[PDB]
RNA sequence: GUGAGCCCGGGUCGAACGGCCUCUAGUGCAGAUCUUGGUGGUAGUAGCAAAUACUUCAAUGAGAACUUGAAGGACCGAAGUG
């Protein structure tokens, strides 16, 4: 029912995934948890993160990751020849007033 | 053949060698914490933990944590990691 090319906006609760993590590993673990979240959400093992998303994660240093973050995940087609996976996800940070109080929402294709 | 050993078959190989009687010796090894060389178990084991710390995209390439550019985060802190 859902096409291969599709974009949705999610709220990721990184606080419960980084609870108790070593301080020098909290932000790389946040990067890996975002990749794991995207793989679980879209079924794609190939996940690419926007550099502004990386800046948002690293905004307050190595141990100052935000508790919540609003992201847009876009499942797109891998058009390159000889690609192992036909689909991949691209994750971007979303400019919102407050990441709290938001539901998962389908981004309009237009 | 009591024995130290001797002889033959089969396989491998490529240029010399043996029996008998005498002559001759640097002539017979399991040890010497023996000498030289080679090889095991240990064992895919002990370990690869000082010097705060890495992350994202793109490129290159058969292959990229430890190549490069950009984007971030840090450290030396002028008796410096200049």
Torsion of CA A23, A24, A30, A36, to 10 degrees: -120
Name the residue with tokens 């909290």: A26
Resolution expressed in Å = 2.1
Which method was it determined by? Answer: cryo-EM
Cα Rg of chain A (Å, integer): 14
> Is residue A48 a contact partner of residue A31, using CB atoms and an 8 Å limit?
no
- The Cα A110–Cα A52 span in angstroms is 23
Q: Is A18 helix (H, G, I), strand (E, B) or coil?
A: helix
Q: Provide the CA A60 to C1' B74 distance, Å, integer.
A: 12
Name the protein residue, with chain letter, whose CA is nearest the C1' of B71.
A51
Task: For residue A1, give both structure tokens.
Answer: 């029912």
Question: Which helix H or strand E contains A76, and what residues bound it?
Answer: strand A68-77
């Amino acid at each position: 029912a859902i096409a291969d090319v599709v974009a949705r906006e999610y709220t990721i609760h990184l606080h419960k995934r980084l609870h108790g993590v070593t301080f020098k590993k909290r932000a790389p673990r946040a990067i890996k948890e975002i990749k794991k979240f995207a793989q679980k959400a879209m079924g794609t093992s190939d996940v690419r993160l926007d550099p502004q998303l990386n800046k948002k994660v690293w905004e307050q240093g190595i141990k100052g990751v935000p508790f919540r973050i609003r992201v847009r995940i876009s499942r797109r087609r891998n058009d390159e020849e000889g690609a192992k996976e036909k689909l991949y996800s691209y994750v971007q940070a979303v400019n919102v007033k407050n990441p709290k109080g938001l539901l998962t929402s389908v981004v309009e294709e237009e």
